[PDB]
Design a protein around this nucleic acid. Structure first.
Lengths: 95, 103, 78, 97, 83, 97, 105, 93
DNA sequence: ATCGATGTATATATCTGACACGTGCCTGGAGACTAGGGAGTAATCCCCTTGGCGGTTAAAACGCGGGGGACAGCGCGTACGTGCGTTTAAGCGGTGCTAGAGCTGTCTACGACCAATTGAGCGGCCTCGGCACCGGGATTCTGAT
DNA sequence: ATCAGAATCCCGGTGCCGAGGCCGCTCAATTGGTCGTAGACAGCTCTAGCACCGCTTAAACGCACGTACGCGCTGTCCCCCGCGTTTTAACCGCCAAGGGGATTACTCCCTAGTCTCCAGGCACGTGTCAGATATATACATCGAT
């Protein structure tokens, strides 16, 4: 009776946002899950490499932004950077 | 929560725990998990949206791996992002070389 | 025992690949290519396994082996 | 009757590019994996899911190799993929000398 | 001072020389334009990441370590320029 | 006029440009090309001289390693001349755009 | 023996390698023997490359290992060439290799 | 007022292997980058092996299987031999 | 087939910038203690792998004939190589300016850390639909007619 | 064209099982509150990047000519393809054994952290020799003759 982490219900909620009637089968669930893991490991690995390259000890939103600009290709990069800036900015807007 | 504070659906708390216990750096700015959770949620929304539509073309209300493969490989900049990724039970893009077609 | 990859199965793989007409020697060459690829991937899987002090090559081991070859594989609890 | 040789091929192509299920059989591939792992550490075991993942990887690999091989063959003005086609595709992807 | 159309600095004999090093015995006349296109695509894909590493370091000078990091990212590690 | 049979000078030039190692693209035009390409990303950048040299080393390595694969493709089609379809096949097999 | 390098019979700096493993954020902790082992492996690999390069230099009757000789050592050895296949080497040149069809008859 | 490198250690290894062959400056730069490359590779692989097992410490076991994962066949065998030999000696006395 | 001469390779004499080496300082490596948490080890549960089998049936294997695609040979035209003479712009050196990298002090915001606590998430469970499918019908392919 | 014989596509009833929804609980995310330090900001310094000029001269360009080679065309043959028949072994469901993965509890030793030396290493500076080139020389070899 342990607690294995996975992004099941999160991907599910994003799905219900973008297709309120379309379900997702457990195997495509696993695929979305491994996709989230892969992309997150890529972005954090590049953020870590940025930090160590500039001799910093903090992964701030600057490093995540440059990681996104390095990994995701052009248009995907621009739109993802916008989405992240908006989320972070909104987070700052609260308290 | 803290994901609601950012208008996200992906859990900023979990992404913080993973950026911290993953040994990516000694410190993790409190604005980093938010940015990263947002980028993950954006890419997941992109994938699932293109996927959904393909499933709807196959007049189906349930995404299966084939639909993810169709979305990831038809989109040009998602292909380049997952160019070196094979998707289990994914099949390929229907593509017969024009020289092989009958004449 | 490599012959288990029968001639029609290689034919089907080539069909899916879009191959229209298949020579006769493609079968032996493809068995060789497959054996090489499997040697590499199972070698890395067994390495990860031995290092985990286990005796059952699990799905995560093969997923990691493929990632290390540069052929990331989504769909097995990665 | 009889189809003009070269059209059952296109029909099989369309049939196998609409499908996703695995093309290589299951038990032959399982015995192949166990034989090949017999040469690295005797008396192994394989989570069934791990054999399935090996199969997905190998089939995706072979499918990609045959796409690039078909490209080489078409490039040489031919239509039948020959061995030298596979050898050139691998020598360019950088897999053997 | 803006520059424009220097892809013709990769002259015809320069590409011919690069080929002769590659082993090519006889070069067609349309190789030059395709090679210039290929070189420009590669250079853009590398200099984008070089400049991105720069801008993230808040510098205004593309160091050689940024070029080496960009190449290592593209998967074409380069040896002999520090780091 | 006295003349070797064509192909001979190309052979001796292959020998000569595979012995030596000096950079082959003329330096200053490459520096200009690098600056011109960089203008589209951040105006008024300064390029460490060794960074420009690193870009030139990488680019010559890439074009030589592309003409090797191109020559393989061309010889595979029973030709000796390399032609744009060869370069495009090499880059399509390698995985580039 | 004072320094860990001499205590381990190596020549590569066990201490510098230990530091790089610590302030590199590869893991919270770094076992005692990990720097020793890693420095031994680094020393073996560089000894192999320098040995082959020195031989390549002695072939051309030169005394200094230039980059050309490192390239000849790496490319002309199957196992190194597989370890360093994605590695450009500045000033490296290429292996002298004309395709078998291009030579005249 | 310091800069790290391996420019002297590679020279010691050279003098130990080829007792009378110098090494140029650019070649020293190349070897100095090769050591850094192999170090980052083996260390990154050992870090992956530490997390994949929910360990925390990079023991010698992790570095060993990382060397087995990276270097090809005979280089792997010889490197593992050299590593275990150096480790064992360090443990000794 | 000789010249021959172009080119390559072999031999020695010279110069010079790069390297191999000899110091002076300094800072990072090493050592001795302390402490505590990570890893080893043993015990136990129970899942999950392996093996064995019997049947059925879809798939593999085999024979064969025929046609269509691979491969060699030839011809022809173009287009690429080669040589010369003319033009261009790289390369080098030298100067001169300065924009920006790089190091350092200060100081404040920000993030780690710890304890409480409270809701989000995981797991077990169950009901409904969605996909596969079978079947019948209708249209559209491929190929001989 | 046509006509047929399948192949494929559409539409509808049907079953099965897997996904989507609910509920209970435990554990990780949140929230304060405190403290240390990373990093930002500024300011100085000086290295190195850029710009420009003038010469020399090697390389690029342009042009002309010939011939090698790319490419189309044709002819032959062998070797895949497609189909029908016989064989074989994969799938599946079931059951049993038991090996090993996974968890928990306990204990110990190995590593982090800290402070205190002190010698290994780096920057500086210097002397010299390895290699590039010059000049001279012996021989391969390309080839039109």
């Amino acid at each position: 009776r342990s607690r294995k982490e996975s992004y099941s219900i999160y991907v599910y909620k994003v799905l219900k946002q973008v297709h309120p009637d379309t379900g997702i089968s457990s195997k495509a669930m696993g695929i979305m899950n491994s996709f989230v893991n892969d992309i997150f490991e890529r972005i954090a690995g590049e953020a870590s490499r940025l930090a160590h390259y500039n001799k910093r000890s903090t992964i701030t939103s600057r490093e995540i932004q440059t990681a996104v600009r390095l990994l995701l290709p052009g248009e995907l990069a621009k739109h993802a950077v916008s989405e992240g800036t908006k989320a972070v900015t909104k987070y700052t807007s609260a308290k | 929560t803290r994901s609601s504070r950012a208008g996200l659906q992906f859990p900023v708390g979990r992404v913080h725990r993973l950026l911290r216990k993953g040994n990516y750096s000694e410190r993790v700015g409190a604005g980093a998990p938010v940015y990263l959770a947002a980028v993950l949620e954006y890419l997941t929304a992109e994938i699932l949206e293109l996927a959904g539509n393909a499933a709807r073309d196959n007049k189906k209300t349930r995404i299966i791996p084939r639909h993810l493969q169709l979305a990831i490989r038809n989109d040009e900049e998602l292909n380049k992002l997952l160019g070196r990724v094979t998707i289990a039970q994914g099949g390929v893009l229907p593509n017969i070389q024009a020289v092989l077609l009958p004449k | 025992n490599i012959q288990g990859i029968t001639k029609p199965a290689i034919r089907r793989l080539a069909r899916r690949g879009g191959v229209k007409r298949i020579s006769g020697l493609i079968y032996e060459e493809t068995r060789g290519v497959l054996k090489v690829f499997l040697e590499n991937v199972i070698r890395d899987a067994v390495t990860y396994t031995e290092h985990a002090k286990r005796k059952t090559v699990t799905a995560m081991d093969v997923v990691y082996a493929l990632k290390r070859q540069g052929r990331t594989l989504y769909g097995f609890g990665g | 009757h009889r189809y003009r040789p070269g059209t059952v091929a296109l029909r099989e192509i369309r049939r196998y590019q609409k499908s996703t299920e695995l093309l290589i059989r299951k038990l032959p591939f399982q015995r192949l994996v166990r034989e090949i792992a017999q040469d690295f550490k005797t008396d192994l075991r394989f989570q069934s899911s791990a054999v399935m993942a090996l199969q997905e990887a190998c089939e995706a690999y072979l499918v990609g190799l045959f796409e690039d091989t078909n490209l080489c063959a078409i490039h040489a003005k031919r239509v039948t993929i020959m061995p030298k086609d596979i050898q050139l595709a691998r020598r360019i992807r950088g897999e053997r000398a």
